[PDB]
Amino acid sequence: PITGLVYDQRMMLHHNMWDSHHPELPQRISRIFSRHEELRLLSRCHRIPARLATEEELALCHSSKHISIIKSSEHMKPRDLNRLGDEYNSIFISNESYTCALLAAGSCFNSAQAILTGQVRNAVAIVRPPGHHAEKDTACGFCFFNTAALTARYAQSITRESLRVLIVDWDVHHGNGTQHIFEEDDSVLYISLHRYEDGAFFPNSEDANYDKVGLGKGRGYNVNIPWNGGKMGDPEYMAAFHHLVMPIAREFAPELVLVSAGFDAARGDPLGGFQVTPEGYAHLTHQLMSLAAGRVLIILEGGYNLTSISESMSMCTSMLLGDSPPSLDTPLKTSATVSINNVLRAHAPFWSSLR
Numbered sequence: 001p002i003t004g005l006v007y008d009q010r011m012m013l014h015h016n017m018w019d020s021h022h023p024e025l026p027q028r029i030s031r032i033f034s035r036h037e038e039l040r041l042l043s044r045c046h047r048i049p050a051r052l053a054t055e056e057e058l059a060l061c062h063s064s065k066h067i068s069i070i071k072s073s074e075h076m077k078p079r080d081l082n083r084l085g086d087e088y089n090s091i092f093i094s095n096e097s098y099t100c101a102l103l104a105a106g107s108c109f110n111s112a113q114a115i116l117t118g119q120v121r122n123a124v125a126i127v128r129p130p131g132h133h134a135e136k137d138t139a140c141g142f143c144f145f146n147t148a149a150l151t152a153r154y155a156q157s158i159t160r161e162s163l164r165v166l167i168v169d170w171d172v173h174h175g176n177g178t179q180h181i182f183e184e185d186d187s188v189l190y191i192s193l194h195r196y197e198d199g200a201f202f203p204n205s206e207d208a209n210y211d212k213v214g215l216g217k218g219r220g221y222n223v224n225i226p227w228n229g230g231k232m233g234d235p236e237y238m239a240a241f242h243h244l245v246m247p248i249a250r251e252f253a254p255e256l257v258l259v260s261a262g263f264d265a266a267r268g269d270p271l272g273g274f275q276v277t278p279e280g281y282a283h284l285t286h287q288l289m290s291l292a293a294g295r296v297l298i299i300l301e302g303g304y305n306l307t308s309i310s311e312s313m314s315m316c317t318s319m320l321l322g323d324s325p326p327s328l329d330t331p332l333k334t335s336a337t338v339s340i341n342n343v344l345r346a347h348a349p350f351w352s353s354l355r
């Protein structure tokens with residue numbers, strides 16, 4: 001039983017020309033990689049090569065205009081990179097950004113292919129820039145192309161069009177691009193846990209509330225678990241997994257699980273304000289490994305405390321490799337119970353496991 005790992009230092013080339021201390025740092029991925037070496041997890045994994053996504057693959061989720069504009073940034077002068085970046089919500093661009101975005105997606109395509117051909121049981125993708133804020137038509141929030149959404153469509157393209165893909169997004173932010181891309185789709189179940197604060201937390205949209213359940217044939221296939229008024233941590237994420245994430249996922253019966261694995265809900269993150277521990281992330285991984293015959297791909301999204309994300313993602317890989325889950329600790333916060341109950345009332349009509 002093999003675990004795959006994809007990492008390519010070329011993804012470090014994407015950088016902020018004017019602010020070498022911008023939190024979406026090149027060393028985010030090299031630090032996670034280094035911690036895998038230190039814990040001697042790297043030699044336990046099979047290395048899956050990176051590759052470039054093709055423009056035809058990008059078109060599975062993105063418009064030709066959006067592809068064309070990001071592609072043109074490779075040849076832009078600094079003044080134009082600044083002006084283009086400023087046209088988006090929270091985006092910086094360098095001449096290498098397009099290439100790195102292509103490498104992040106292609107890395108995940110190769111990992112999903114390795115899983116779906118039975119070459120590996122599961123895999124981890126240490127990639128940047130992130131993806132889940134990227135929309136069909138636009139970049140957003142450090143994301144150029146929606147790597148997890150593209151990977152789900154790539155998976156369907158090499159298997160069957162209706163392959164059931166579950167995307168669990170535990171990044172502290174709502175994946176607005178992933179929700180929108182699949183909102184009318186019953187073949188891709190999107191479940192997000194996120195800090196919400198009644199729409200005030202980035203990305204600042206009420207699209208992230210629990211009452212957005214999907215559209216058309218996708219009604220019931222979009223599950224938003226929004227947190228309000230609390231520094232959430234392990235007890236709250238475990239409760240959400242017990243009452244919502246796992247009963248829904250088991251009923252959906254996915255054939256592949258992608259994790260939009262941002263680590264900005266971790267203790268110590270400068271932006272998320274939450275306190276999920278590396279042991280917490282290990283237990284979330286271990287639970288998801290019970291789905292889809294173990295076919296799980298963990299895709300790095302956000303997370304900006306270099307030490308926290310390195311320890312947190314390494315613990316997820318340890319679980320993928322079959323290691324025993326570590327001990328967990330602290331009472332559950334009642335505001336989390338309020339959120340969980342709101343999602344139960346919104347989704348029990350669609351999911352008999354919640355009744």
Ligand SMILES: O=C(NO)c1ccc(CN(Cc2cccnc2)S(=O)(=O)c2cc(F)c(F)c(F)c2F)cc1
Nearest residue numbers: 090091130141142173202262264271272301302303
């Ligand atoms: O992908 C992400 N996470 O993983 C992610 C995506 C976007 C950002 C951008 N931020 C907003 C933010 C703030 C608080 C909590 N969350 C996110 S920002 O950096 O703070 C920022 C603040 C500004 F006031 C501003 F003008 C910016 F241009 C800007 F970028 C962060 C992370």
Ligand SMILES: [K+]
Nearest residue numbers: 169171173193
């Ligand atoms: K999320």
Ligand SMILES: [K+]
Nearest residue numbers: 180183207212
């Ligand atoms: K929406």
Ligand SMILES: [K+]
Nearest residue numbers: 182185188221
């Ligand atoms: K959906």
Ligand SMILES: [Zn+2]
Nearest residue numbers: 171173262302
């Ligand atoms: Zn995030």
